[PDB]
Amino acid sequence: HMTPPKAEKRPYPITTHGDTRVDDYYWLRDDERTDPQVLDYLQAENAFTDAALKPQQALRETLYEEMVARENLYFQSVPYVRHGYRYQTRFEPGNEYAIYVRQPQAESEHWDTLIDGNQRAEQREFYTLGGLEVSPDNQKLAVAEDFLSRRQYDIRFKNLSDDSWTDEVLENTSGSFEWANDSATVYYVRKHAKTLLPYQVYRHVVGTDPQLDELIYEEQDDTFYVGLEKTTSDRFILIHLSSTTTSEILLLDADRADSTPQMFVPRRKDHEYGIDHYHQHFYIRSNKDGKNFGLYQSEQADEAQWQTLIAPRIEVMLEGFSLFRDWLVVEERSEGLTQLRQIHWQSGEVKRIAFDDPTYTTWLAYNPEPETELLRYGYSSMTTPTTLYELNLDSDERVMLKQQEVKNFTPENYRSERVWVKARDGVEVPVSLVYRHDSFARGTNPLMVYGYGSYGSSMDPAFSASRLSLLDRGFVFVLAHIRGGGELGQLWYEDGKLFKKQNTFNDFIDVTEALIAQGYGDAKRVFAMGGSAGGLLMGAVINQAPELFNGIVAQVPFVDVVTTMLDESIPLTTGEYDEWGNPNQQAYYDYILQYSPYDQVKAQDYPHMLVTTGLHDSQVQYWEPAKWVAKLRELKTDDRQLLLYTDMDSGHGGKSGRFKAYEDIALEYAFILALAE
């Protein structure tokens, strides 16, 4: 029926290494975001989307309502104890925002309000709590708040004696801060006034003019993120400097006046390390001897003094650790599963935490106090809603503390599987899938295949309540654990980035083909979704294997890869040379251009596609998807649905859009369900 919007073509040549690319829609980029012809194209496309999806209104309402109906309005967090006070977070169905309360540990009856987000947000357009921490002496509250939706956090201080606030604000912070042990001095991270990258550490006396704050450290290399931590011992505040590949940690004495940063181990390309301090020792997770990391103990900084506790293993990725009185607990990945292991400091006794599920995730949860035998850890699976457990490390007694509540849900209605796919290069790729038992008939069910596959981020198999809206309508939901993710450790990441990035896209295709070949789904009703770097995945896969998929959702997709990575004026570019490569080098230019989805759009049939972006935010810049849709409309040879939905919001005023996240999920799901009908 309806004529889609047609963006004006303004041929813009980009020549690199003697290769001229002509970009007809380069002009859709306006960094000021005011060019009225740019806004007219984005608005036209939104009106086209509104018009094309108008018949799906009833279905979007049905989906929205059943998704909100699964959720308990009245959420209370699991209380935790820190420095002799018990803390709970509370949500009331009335309230937009959480209320944070606390009470002395020996108290039951009365709870004091620490901060009520609804009250802080009064007469403001926007509110995000970026951080909250009481001082060691329990007398002052430090908070990092964004009232402007720019992820620039203001830090403010509350006297808990009388609920009065101090007069100063620390502005343009990352929201990362630590208390010195005097409960009077705080260290915080200031963002660059132009790039907004975190780059300076300041020392502030609470109550005083921030003009008086002392510059403690400035990072010269803006590929290095600057964060603050505090050791389990409380002895040190850590300046944690890291790029994608390289770390460096400086120590601030948390007990003494006028501390200056003490070098731990000077940065060395491809050495990633993180430390803690406890029982008068440093504990270091380091890749110095192996890509899968080891754990070391040291009395001093000197790398040559680091004693091996856990050697790097090819079959086991070491992800993180927690320190307790009698036990070390580590988080590891092996054979495509997450695992926890405990090791006794004195006996050397090793225990593994046991599960019985093919598709689950387990992780160390929040354990703020080390003088305990009680470990808190999380568990989730594709069939079991997210659970917090408390384990006695000595007795092995496992107690549930909290379950995610899911209304209108019977877990035995669903089944999950782990599937391994031999990829085209013979590498085994794990898959996690879930579906409703009573509607499953081999070869007949629609498939929804989800992937990400960048930065060594893992799409670990866990529970989703919103996913039940697909499962209860006959979908088989698939997580494809493709290379570039981290499910099989650092080498799984490195075999899906830089000059191996094409493995990500190949794995996604190989998994999809295998699941159809094996009878998990209907060959004619295969859907996929991915966002941001997962949208790069969607964009490459539909250029390379357009016939495989019925329909696609590509959220905020990274698709203009070569042009973006040639331009340091775009946020992210200077930090992503170690992900995609630097196309100022001919070798990277050719390797990236081969998959860059915007460049590889051809005159061929594409699947149905919904593409989303946002004007006023960031991440992937709005122009990449808008150029991609314009180019697809110009070249594609099919008559299928192609829609661009641009979020125009001033921001997302509701934490980050609570209602709105469910509205977006309803619109995407209705789009896909309408295609499967």
Side-chain angles (χ1 to χ4, degrees):
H1 37 200
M2 311 181 303
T3 305
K6 190 174 68 168
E8 184 185 356
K9 311 210 306 294
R10 302 187 203 164
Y12 187 94
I14 308 176
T15 299
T16 328
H17 307 121
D19 188 51
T20 298
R21 300 175 302 127
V22 168
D23 183 350
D24 282 343
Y25 309 101
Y26 189 81
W27 74 268
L28 286 177
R29 182 169 165 194
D30 178 19
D31 289 337
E32 313 301 322
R33 289 165 163 73
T34 62
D35 182 325
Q37 270 113 290
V38 170
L39 303 179
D40 272 345
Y41 180 63
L42 298 183
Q43 292 180 334
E45 282 289 17
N46 273 348
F48 189 77
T49 301
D50 284 348
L53 295 189
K54 200 65 84 353
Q56 294 171 23
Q57 182 67 31
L59 177 55
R60 290 193 290 274
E61 290 179 4
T62 295
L63 292 165
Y64 177 82
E65 290 164 19
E66 89 183 18
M67 289 182 292
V68 169
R70 282 178 197 127
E71 294 305 324
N72 205 99
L73 17 148
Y74 298 91
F75 185 78
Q76 306 212 331
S77 70
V78 175
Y80 66 81
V81 168
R82 194 179 74 81
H83 300 335
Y85 278 75
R86 183 177 296 105
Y87 294 81
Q88 190 172 53
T89 308
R90 289 165 178 181
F91 299 83
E92 342 280 339
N95 293 347
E96 255 273 61
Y97 298 104
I99 298 167
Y100 289 83
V101 296
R102 76 172 191 158
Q103 66 182 1
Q105 176 173 11
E107 170 67 26
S108 297
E109 237 294 60
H110 194 59
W111 299 82
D112 298 297
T113 303
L114 268 168
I115 198 160
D116 175 346
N118 308 295
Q119 186 280 139
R120 288 253 105 191
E122 278 167 18
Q123 299 149 235
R124 306 302 337 229
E125 296 189 0
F126 301 105
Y127 188 73
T128 307
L129 188 59
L132 208 192
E133 193 182 45
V134 180
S135 59
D137 73 354
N138 281 304
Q139 299 311 295
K140 298 178 161 57
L141 174 67
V143 303
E145 302 167 301
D146 191 5
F147 294 94
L148 291 177
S149 198
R150 197 132 104 181
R151 300 172 196 89
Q152 298 189 130
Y153 293 94
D154 290 337
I155 304 179
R156 283 181 175 89
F157 302 95
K158 184 192 189 165
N159 305 299
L160 300 178
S161 58
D162 60 17
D163 295 318
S164 72
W165 291 78
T166 70
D167 298 313
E168 81 277 28
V169 57
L170 310 177
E171 295 175 281
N172 194 199
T173 83
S174 71
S176 175
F177 65 81
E178 295 291 345
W179 285 102
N181 289 154
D182 64 2
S183 295
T185 313
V186 311
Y187 293 87
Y188 66 98
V189 178
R190 181 173 307 160
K191 329 224 305 157
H192 196 271
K194 282 74 195 274
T195 67
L196 263 61
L197 295 178
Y199 92 121
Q200 296 177 314
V201 175
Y202 281 89
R203 174 195 286 129
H204 176 69
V205 180
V206 172
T208 69
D209 188 349
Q211 262 312 295
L212 298 178
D213 292 4
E214 308 170 273
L215 170 68
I216 301 306
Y217 179 80
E218 187 173 321
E219 180 46 50
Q220 303 311 130
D221 180 343
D222 73 5
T223 66
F224 277 74
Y225 183 93
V226 178
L228 295 163
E229 293 152 8
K230 189 164 175 177
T231 59
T232 294
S233 69
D234 295 322
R235 293 287 72 76
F236 298 107
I237 290 170
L238 303 188
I239 302 176
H240 193 161
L241 281 351
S242 64
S243 66
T244 146
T245 187
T246 310
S247 307
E248 185 176 279
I249 306 220
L250 292 17
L251 276 49
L252 263 7
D253 182 337
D255 292 308
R256 284 175 198 73
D258 299 334
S259 292
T260 63
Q262 301 305 125
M263 180 57 72
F264 203 70
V265 168
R267 61 186 74 188
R268 179 180 68 244
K269 189 70 174 164
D270 297 325
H271 179 32
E272 168 175 352
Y273 75 89
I275 79 177
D276 198 358
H277 178 267
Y278 181 62
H279 287 345
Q280 323 285 194
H281 318 298
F282 297 99
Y283 292 94
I284 308 102
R285 169 177 174 272
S286 166
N287 73 346
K288 65 183 179 75
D289 297 333
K291 281 176 156 174
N292 269 357
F293 292 80
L295 193 72
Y296 303 85
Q297 173 194 143
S298 200
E299 310 321 314
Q300 63 212 319
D302 178 5
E303 183 182 334
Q305 256 32 47
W306 297 3
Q307 299 289 330
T308 304
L309 268 31
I310 304 173
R313 299 140 294 165
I314 39 79
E315 47 278 287
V316 182
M317 173 75 173
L318 174 61
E319 292 287 24
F321 65 98
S322 286
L323 304 170
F324 299 89
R325 179 180 65 220
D326 289 315
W327 299 91
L328 167 68
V329 188
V330 297
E331 203 168 42
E332 292 173 325
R333 293 177 182 274
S334 192
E335 300 161 33
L337 285 327
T338 49
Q339 66 183 225
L340 299 176
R341 292 198 301 132
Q342 55 177 109
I343 303 98
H344 196 97
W345 293 118
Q346 313 299 142
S347 74
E349 189 183 11
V350 182
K351 314 185 193 169
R352 314 207 140 63
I353 320 310
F355 292 112
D356 182 13
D357 189 294
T359 58
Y360 72 89
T361 314
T362 193
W363 62 96
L364 293 164
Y366 188 42
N367 290 102
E369 290 292 344
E371 303 312 318
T372 188
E373 63 276 286
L374 302 173
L375 170 66
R376 291 185 179 197
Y377 71 87
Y379 175 84
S380 193
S381 86
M382 297 190 101
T383 54
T384 301
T386 302
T387 303
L388 184 71
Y389 289 118
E390 191 164 65
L391 176 63
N392 188 308
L393 292 159
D394 293 312
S395 83
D396 311 323
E397 180 192 3
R398 182 171 95 196
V399 166
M400 181 273 286
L401 292 184
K402 191 70 158 181
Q403 296 181 298
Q404 171 185 3
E405 191 188 335
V406 191
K407 292 163 181 158
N408 304 317
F409 163 70
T410 298
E412 56 267 50
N413 288 342
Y414 311 95
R415 273 140 190 76
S416 59
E417 294 185 33
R418 169 60 45 82
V419 176
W420 288 87
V421 170
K422 197 160 76 106
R424 68 183 68 184
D425 67 344
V427 174
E428 295 289 335
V429 175
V431 181
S432 302
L433 62 85
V434 64
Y435 59 87
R436 185 175 177 116
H437 172 61
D438 72 1
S439 51
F440 187 81
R442 298 198 332 122
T444 76
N445 296 269
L447 278 171
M448 167 55 79
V449 190
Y450 188 94
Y452 186 72
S454 298
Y455 302 107
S457 301
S458 299
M459 298 298 103
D460 288 319
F463 192 78
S464 169
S466 63
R467 187 185 294 157
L468 292 173
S469 298
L470 293 184
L471 301 195
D472 286 340
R473 288 180 180 79
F475 269 71
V476 178
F477 184 91
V478 183
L479 299 171
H481 308 292
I482 65 193
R483 280 174 276 192
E487 292 85 340
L488 293 176
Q490 185 67 27
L491 267 50
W492 200 241
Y493 171 30
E494 295 187 355
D495 210 27
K497 70 181 304 196
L498 294 166
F499 293 115
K500 297 290 190 173
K501 181 61 191 177
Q502 179 62 43
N503 284 338
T504 300
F505 317 137
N506 286 350
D507 285 353
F508 195 79
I509 288 162
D510 293 349
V511 160
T512 304
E513 286 190 346
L515 259 17
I516 295 167
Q518 293 173 211
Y520 285 93
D522 180 359
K524 295 182 264 184
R525 292 187 296 165
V526 183
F527 302 91
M529 176 179 316
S532 197
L536 168 56
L537 165 68
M538 288 304 95
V541 157
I542 68 175
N543 282 338
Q544 290 171 9
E547 292 301 313
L548 227 194
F549 295 99
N550 185 314
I552 300 296
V553 182
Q555 307 154 332
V556 286
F558 183 33
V559 288
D560 200 14
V561 181
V562 168
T563 293
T564 287
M565 288 305 302
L566 281 172
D567 191 343
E568 300 205 332
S569 82
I570 300 170
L572 282 79
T573 291
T574 59
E576 289 203 328
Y577 297 144
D578 284 330
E579 191 69 16
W580 324 113
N582 188 335
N584 295 293
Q585 290 286 151
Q586 191 164 338
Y588 282 122
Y589 178 91
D590 289 329
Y591 189 90
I592 302 165
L593 182 56
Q594 198 79 279
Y595 64 79
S596 184
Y598 181 67
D599 299 286
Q600 299 305 347
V601 171
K602 28 185 175 291
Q604 71 177 1
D605 282 1
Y606 282 90
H608 302 277
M609 192 158 54
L610 171 64
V611 179
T612 73
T613 193
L615 178 52
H616 284 302
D617 184 348
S618 204
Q619 188 73 330
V620 178
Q621 312 289 290
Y622 73 87
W623 58 85
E624 299 195 19
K627 295 166 44 171
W628 187 44
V629 169
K631 182 170 185 186
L632 281 159
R633 294 210 188 282
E634 177 202 319
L635 296 180
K636 70 195 217 126
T637 58
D638 63 278
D639 300 307
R640 300 187 185 116
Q641 298 162 210
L642 174 59
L643 303 175
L644 177 65
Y645 181 58
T646 302
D647 181 1
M648 293 302 195
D649 279 356
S650 188
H652 20 36
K655 257 119 153 60
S656 197
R658 257 65 206 288
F659 172 64
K660 178 262 206 160
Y662 281 128
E663 283 186 291
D664 290 344
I665 292 165
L667 182 143
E668 297 169 353
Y669 278 6
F671 167 79
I672 291 294
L673 288 164
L675 294 174
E677 184 48 22

